[PDB]
């Protein structure tokens, strides 16, 4: 606290206090969680509708990185969009130099460390933004990440990102998802979601689906749950 | 970076520059030494005590050689000596590329201590917390030389930086003279650098370093513990 | 010069002459025409001399720092992927006859082709060099689909000793290497 | 005293002291670890825990052992966004030596570098002086193992047996009574002393699932990180 | 705090660019006025000593030989605007054979004043009049430092710019003739201003387009002062 | 108030004031208008005269002969935008010899506005772009904020006093796709004439519409051919 | 060639306790002479010279750059400079110019500033330095001074012996040249003085 401005300064205790703001920051931004099974990755995220001219799909928090990887944003969105280019441009280098897909525990790394040197400088502010990674391939399995602001960088099994991240976990780990399939896992992903303060007291919301995985063929891409209509069918049966 | 090239060093309206003066106390509250000046030879001596019994001694050294002629201690904090060292071998190198001859020990210290000068007038960086005491023994007469981190250097017969550096000089003082030999200089520089240590002094307390008209040469431990056997 | 290179079930199998000359005079009498860059992973060089020992310190540089990063085993076809990226690069100042050659785990025994130009092509055997030239109707009429690893080393050894009958770059001793997923066996083979 | 702004960025205050650097001297000690090194021997060990919180959490990826090069390895106390940018610069570095000069770098030399960089974060102004800590292990051949320590200050040493973390002065003041009688370190001795140190320090007696132990010898110098059964192994073997 | 060098306000506008607009108002006064027979234009001189020279104070320059000018407030950053709109109108005929029209000119003049700081430093102090006889007919123009650029008819600014428009506005009307609005501004003038109205106070500008010479009247100006 | 200072200086709260200050500098600017139908994209703004007798200041720019913005806030990060915007559109016209796609355009804008506001050095753009384009699938209408971030819309009113046209477009956006340009322009100048004070009129002095279209190339009109889209309207019941 | 385009002759030789010099004095392009007074030996502190010879160009630049550091040497310094360290120094000259290099040889002679040991050296025109204890030469007539100096050399010699062995090498060499003559100026040094004496030579 004043001793709290720059973030290349520490406090008599021995931390930094803009690295400190900054977490918070993605506080305050819309649950968005992560869950992988034994052969996917599915992500979900909860949007809600700014007034009601949103033109449905627009501004969306689930990006697509590579051919194999996306990312599951929360906090400034456009922090995040700037952070979503330079995942692109570090994969295609990967690929210009070596020849094949970008490992997930490699591409990890060179975000994260490109997010932990903005957290050195006076010139400079830490990001506002945290994410998830997922990926799948057939020499690899299912990989699932999570980067902070601060830019520790490692693996769950699931996860959660924004107000309701300890409200969600809670009943994230009642699940059997070692051994479940990935078009299981999507109809018990909505149900998480709607749960926990869809809009109670806000005012409206659409869920996004992002998926990846073994019937997926390795490609990402979001759910065909616009067909069937699958999701919002078995989910919300959950009111009593 | 931004460049933002500024000194953090300015007059007083006394006219003190302070932030040198600031470092100079982190060189007095240094690890004591001494260093005399012979009639044919250098003796360099300093302090040098582990906080615990799980201290390596062969890992980190005191006395080091710059040319085979050369040898350069210190007192104060201990990474800041590290930089100068590794300027000063790529220094005198220099000399040695241009001329194909080793480079004189007066000739070495106007280019050093433009070293620590440039740090103090620069932007943004802080001066140094380390000074010196630079030997050797070139064109017969040997010399003994220190530097400050202000910049300036001097020519000493025998004298001590470090802790309690007004007691040992005014106990040099009582005790040099015009002339010994190297193997009496050790002897009053080890008994001026018993008076500052602690209880208990070994081959492993103290760490010493010579210069004789052969080359630079530091002593290993057997000597010195043959040396401060009994013979005070 | 002249390298070869055959595949098999298992892994592959490398050979090379010597007889590094200069004019019309041996200069080295007895030379390892082929390089470890990794444990599973060499490569036999053809061209200028110097040119191709500049390059096969920097991918051993490369590929051995990048490695260590991911805790994995590396690729054959990402070596041969570097070799690529530095000849077609650095063209009209090298003359480097690469042929990278190894085992993998993901694969097996891979055999990659990078010539002067700066292609790179996965082959099934591989010739190189000077006198590579001579066996090219030799080793096509006598190669056959299916072969054991006591067959290849039979095999590349009648074929470098025809390049190597008399031809003034070739000859010398011939250096044999045998990659597999259990070890590297080299041996030098004479009379 | 607080002159000018000693207190905020890296100048000299009275009394020749300075307090960013001495700030981060404890900013080891947010991390909530502790991480024992022990030289007795033809070997060298090195045992830290980990702390998993979570079920979510993974294993593999909570791992603090680094593998520098195949015959140097390291463990990070501190921050873990600092720690692992280090270990950046000490991959790179560690290679840089075999393309310049051809061999295999020494442990010793290699220390040196690394509080090199640290040295100038120190010196120089709007550089935040990375708040973490190293320690290495590794086999010098006609030198036999060595242990060594580098500080955020820059200062290195090497020494017989180490203590890092939050719990220095009472697991030091335990091997100063441990090595006293320089008894045979027989490698069991090694790691006996090394368990029972951080088994009565932080007082656990733990179950054989929550620590990490690297290792490095002179019958095999590759550096090895141990197996959970083989952990167990010599975890019962001290059950007298 | 309270606003330094780059920094946005609470509720509006930069108070450095905010604080520009007030140095113009410790500047001299200057009217220009658009007519369909030609652009008149007037200024006051504000001499302050009489071995300072008369003759040595501009305040009309002459851009091209069919674009005038007017500048108030700083004299020493007015020179380096009227330095690049001469060569930019030059570069343009180099490259085009072409007159360069009166609004593209401030164009490019209001570009360079968009740049201050470090980015590759000060805002500006003068506010322009640009009087011009372009295809379009006669024009007139008007910037500030804030870049805000606009197409006057009638337009005054300097000291005692606030009293001058007020009067100003209505004695204009659309059907004006050129000697007719040389008399209507300099009844202004002297209304504003506080010394006795003689040939050394003010000079005048007009162009027209069948006279794209004579951008400056010289003691013809001696003959309108009498007159009224 | 010491954290109010700088772009890089994060709040014990979690908000940088200094982009929450430039969005009040978009609310300076007068208001304007932009929304679309199935085939025609058309945005209409507001003049604001500067003196009794000096020209309007114009709002609406060309761009491109497919892409046409707006303007709300400053002047001088409005031209600085406009001549990145304008060298953006010609460079996929010398490489690719196609007109750009409008969605992709505007991920430039923010990739352009993003770092001024991390570094120090620069204050961020004080701007309120609205965008309308064609590209392949149909019209859009976007928005920008100085916070960097583009939003999607069908229909969008910003600047000064313009919650009041939010109203009116929420209540008749259901009646937006099907109509035609004859009343689509004047759906959309019935929403100008609540961000108006109760006793002026919209003239034809001070106000302009743009339209692009599928087939029609994107046109300003203003101040003479106002008048027949000024045609055929009730006054406002007083 | 380009060393052929003005000519020069420059020689040294080792005596007793003392060590002597000599050069011409024809200045000119090609075939035309211009002057008899160009001066190609440069002291360079007190008892001990250097010589130069080549391109004219280069031996007018070289003098003055030589000529640069040794001032700035000798300040740093209070000591004199010792004839191994003006060898090392003028190595150093010449090879940074490696690939656009001064077209010049030179030739230092001189005495120790302590003891009265002699010194001769020659370079290359980049920076090959070469200690003899007879003499060295350099020049365009360069074989017409290995011819005289292989016979009249004596190992211990007086100065008045060897101002006239040096006399005779100059004089019956030059003279076989065409391109160098006209005056040949002998410096003969030692430990008490300094002796500059020139000679009577064909002035065709």
Known sequence: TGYDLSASTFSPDGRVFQVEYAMKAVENSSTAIGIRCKDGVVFGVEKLVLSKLYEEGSNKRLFNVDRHVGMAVAGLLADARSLADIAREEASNFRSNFGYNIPLKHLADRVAMYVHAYTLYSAVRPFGCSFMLGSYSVNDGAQLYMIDPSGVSYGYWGCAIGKARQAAKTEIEKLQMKEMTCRDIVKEVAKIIYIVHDEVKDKAFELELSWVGELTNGRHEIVPKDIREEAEKYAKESLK | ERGYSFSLTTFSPSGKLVQIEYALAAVAGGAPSVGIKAANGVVLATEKKQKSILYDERSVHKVEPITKHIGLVYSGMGPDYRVLVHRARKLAQQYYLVYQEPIPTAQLVQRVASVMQEYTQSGGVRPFGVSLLICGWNEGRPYLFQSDPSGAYFAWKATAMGKNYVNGKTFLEKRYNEDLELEDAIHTAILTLKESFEGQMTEDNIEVGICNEAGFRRLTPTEVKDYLAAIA | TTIMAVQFDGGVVLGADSRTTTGSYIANRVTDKLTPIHDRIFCCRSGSAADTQAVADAVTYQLGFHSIELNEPPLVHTAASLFKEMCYRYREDLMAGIIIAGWDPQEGGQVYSVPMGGMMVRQSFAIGGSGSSYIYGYVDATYREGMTKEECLQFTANALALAMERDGSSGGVIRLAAIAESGVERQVLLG | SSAGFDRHITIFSPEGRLYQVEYAFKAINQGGLTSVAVRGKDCAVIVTQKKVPDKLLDSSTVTHLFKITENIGCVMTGMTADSRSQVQRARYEAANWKYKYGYEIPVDMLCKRIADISQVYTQNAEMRPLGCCMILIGIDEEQGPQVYKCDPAGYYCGFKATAAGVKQTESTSFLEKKVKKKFDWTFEQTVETAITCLSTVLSIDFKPSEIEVGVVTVENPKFRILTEAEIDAHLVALAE | ?228 | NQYDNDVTVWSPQGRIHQIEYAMEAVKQGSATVGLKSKTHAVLVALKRAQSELAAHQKKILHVDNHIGISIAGLTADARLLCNFMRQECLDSRFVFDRPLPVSRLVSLIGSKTQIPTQRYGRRPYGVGLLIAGYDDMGPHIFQTCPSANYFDCRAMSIGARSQSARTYLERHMSEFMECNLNELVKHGLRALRETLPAEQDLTTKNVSIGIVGKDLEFTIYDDDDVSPFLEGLEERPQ | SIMSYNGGAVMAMKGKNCVAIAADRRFGIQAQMVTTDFQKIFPMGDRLYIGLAGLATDVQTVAQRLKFRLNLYELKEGRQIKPYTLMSMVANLLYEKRFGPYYTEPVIAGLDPKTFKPFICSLDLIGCPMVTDDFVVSGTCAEQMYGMCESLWEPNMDPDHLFETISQAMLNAVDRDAVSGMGVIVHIIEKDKITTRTLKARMD
């Open chain 5, 1 to 228: 705090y309270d606003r330094g060098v780059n920094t946005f306000s609470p509720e509006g506008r930069l108070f450095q660019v905010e604080y520009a607009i007030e140095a113009i108002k410790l500047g001299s006064t200057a009217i220009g006025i658009q007519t369909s027979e030609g652009v008149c234009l007037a200024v006051e001189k504000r001499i302050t000593s009489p071995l300072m020279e008369p003759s040595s104070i501009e305040k009309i320059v002459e851009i091209d030989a069919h674009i005038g000018c007017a500048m108030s407030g700083l004299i020493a950053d007015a020179k380096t605007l009227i330095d690049k709109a001469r060569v930019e109108t030059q570069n343009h005929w180099f490259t085009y054979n072409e007159t360069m029209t009166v609004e593209s000119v401030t164009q490019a003049v209001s570009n360079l004043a968009l740049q201050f700081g470090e980015e590759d430093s000060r805002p500006f102090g003068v506010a322009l009049l640009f009087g011009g006889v372009d295809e379009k007919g006669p024009q007139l123009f008007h910037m500030d430092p804030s870049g805000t650029f606009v197409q006057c008819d009638a337009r005054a600014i300097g000291s005692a710019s606030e009293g001058a428009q007020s009067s100003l506005q209505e004695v204009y009307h659309k059907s004006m003739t050129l000697k007719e609005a040389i008399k209507s501004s300099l009844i202004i003038l002297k209304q504003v201003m506080e010394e006795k109205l003689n040939a050394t106070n003010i000079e005048l500008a007009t162009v027209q387009p069948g006279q794209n010479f004579h951008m400056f009247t010289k003691e013809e100006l001696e003959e309108v002062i009498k007159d009224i």
